[PDB]
Structures are given as structure tokens and as C-alpha cells.
């Protein structure tokens, strides 16, 4: 339950990061499902990528 | 990649609250064979909870 909640919360944040493109979001989310123990690292990577793609 | 795609689409649905989204993800994990039914249920709930 803990991991499913973690990936649900992290996944929701990832898909709502406004500067990511759809393939980037989908790739992070697929990685989340494949290895939920990486949720914090994937969220952090996604946020950094999002910030580098700011207008 | 059917289960992964359903997970992705569930996470994208804007009008689910956190408890509802978490519950769908848990159900997907518990029985991935039901991905299409769960996604359809989630979509229905999403549309019913559109801001009015």
C-alpha cells in the first residue's frame, strides 16, 4: 500500500509538471511502475528537467 | 504496456481526488488484468466530478 500510494502521489506530480512534454512524463511514469522504490529519485529528476525547460 | 498505460491515464485524470486516484492505482496493482475496466470507471468518476 505504501509503495502504491507513493507512486500515485509522485506520478500525479510528474504528469502535472507544466514544462515537460508528454513522452517525458510517460517515460518517468513507466519507470515508476517498473520500480516503485525509485519514486523519490524519479520525482526529483523530473522536477529538475521541468525547471530546465521553463519558458 | 497496457497496465502502464492505464496507470499513466489514471494519473492524468484531473478530477479525481487523492483518495480516489490512490484507490484506482491500488486496484490496478491488485488485478492488472482489469486495467481497461478500471480506467473506464475512473474516467466516468472524473467526468462526474468536473467543476460546475
Residue numbers in the entry:
A (entry chain B): 3 to 57
B (entry chain A): 7 to 58
Question: Any passages from the paper?
Answer:
We adopted the Z domain of staphylococcal protein A and its affibody binder dimer complex as a model system. We next generated libraries at the interface of a weakly associating dimer (Z+ ZSPA-1) with micromolar affinity to determine if we could affinity-mature the interface by coevolution. To clarify these inter-residue co-variations discovered from the sequence data, we determined crystal structures of 10 coevolved pairs that spanned a range of cross-reactivities and orthogonalities (5 from LL1 and 5 from LL2). From the structures, we could verify clear compensatory changes between the residues showing the most significant covariations (13A-9B / 17A-31B) in both LL1 and LL2 library mutants.
The backbone structures of the three mutants are relatively similar (Cα r.m.s.d. of Z-A after aligning Z-B ranges from 0.447 Å to 0.641 Å). The dimer interactions of LL2.c17 have sharply diverged from the other two LL2 mutants, with the Phe13A-centered hydrophobic patch surrounded by multiple rewired hydrogen bonds, an additional hydrogen bond between Asn11A and Phe32BTyr, and α-helix 2 of Z-A was slightly shifted to generate new interactions with helix 1 of Z-B, which explains the significantly improved affinity between these two proteins compared to the original pair. Binding of VFLV/IVVY and LVLF/FIIV are highly enthalpically favored and entropically disfavored, but by the end of the trajectory we see a more moderate enthalpy of binding coupled with a moderately disfavored entropy in IVFF/FILV.
